[PDB]
Structure 1
């Protein structure tokens, strides 16, 4: 039901008693193109193990995007550490206008029309986290009405 693609594979090293030990990190996004998305980061000695662990993690850290006409309800700017993300709604027939990481995250969420921008530090991990945070902080007309009026 959930389809998977890779954000990035990296190999990190740590010193030992005369030698180097390498561990692989995977950033994985999962989705259904229906308004649900998940992100995970998996660290393991081996690449397949890293991918499995990252997917496993992503399958619980789950977010529902309030899609409407395949676009974001409203614009939002979000800061995570030294990274900044900007998302803006688009009219039907625009397309996903994003970098590798934001495009990958937004496509699986079912978003079809959006204008994005990256500011400050452009480290993939922080950009991905910022994107997820921005997605989590989205509201619709109904939600605002319910909170205000009641």
Structure 2
């Protein structure tokens, strides 16, 4: 249904008498390009099954994104423990200037104009989570004046 795309695949390992058995990792983003976006990470003894699992887990953890005409409502400096990322809105015709990771996410988010920067740890996995939790925290004048309403 949605646009499917993954950031990284990786083969981990685990020692064991006689040898080292492997698993594969898959960081996958899913998005409608209109607001819905989600991210999954799945592991499985083979690549394809791994991408599938990631695709599945991804379709679970979804999130809306308050796009104000291709852009974001307001900047945010969310730090995911070790990693830190900075989203910042921009005028149209700017395009999405970001690293491989937030690029993949923000794009499927249907975002098209936004400048960013990955301060702190550059770890893909954590940079990914950071971006998600980042978006999950965006707000519009609506939700805002809605809270300063308390009606």
Structure-2 separation of matches of 1:81 and 1:74:
22
Structure-2 separation of matches of 1:135 and 1:101:
14
How far residue 131 of structure 1 moved from its aligned partner, in angstroms, is: 0.3
**Aligned residue-pair number:** 150
How far residue 127 of structure 1 moved from its aligned partner, in angstroms, is: 0.3
- Unmatched runs of 5 consecutive residues or more in structure 1: none
Which 4+ runs in 1 deviate beyond 2 A?
A: none
Structure-1 separation of matches of 2:141 and 2:73:
8
Structure-2 separation of matches of 1:146 and 1:22:
50
How far residue 99 of structure 1 moved from its aligned partner, in angstroms, is: 0.6
TM-score, length-scaled by structure 2: 0.97
How far residue 17 of structure 1 moved from its aligned partner, in angstroms, is: 1.8
TM-score, length-scaled by structure 1: 0.98
How far residue 92 of structure 1 moved from its aligned partner, in angstroms, is: 1.0
Alignment of 1:43-82 (within 5 A): 43-82=43-82
How far residue 124 of structure 1 moved from its aligned partner, in angstroms, is: 0.2
How far residue 18 of structure 1 moved from its aligned partner, in angstroms, is: 1.4
Structure-2 separation of matches of 1:129 and 1:29:
11
SS in 2 for 1:5: strand
How far residue 3 of structure 1 moved from its aligned partner, in angstroms, is: 1.3
Could you say what the CA RMSD is over the residues aligned between the two structures, in angstroms? Answer: 0.7
- Unmatched runs of 5 consecutive residues or more in structure 2: none
Provide Cα deviations, 1:13-56, integer angstroms capped at 9, x if missing partner.
10112111010000000101001101000000000110010000
SS in 1 for 2:54: helix
Structure-2 separation of matches of 1:75 and 1:13:
39
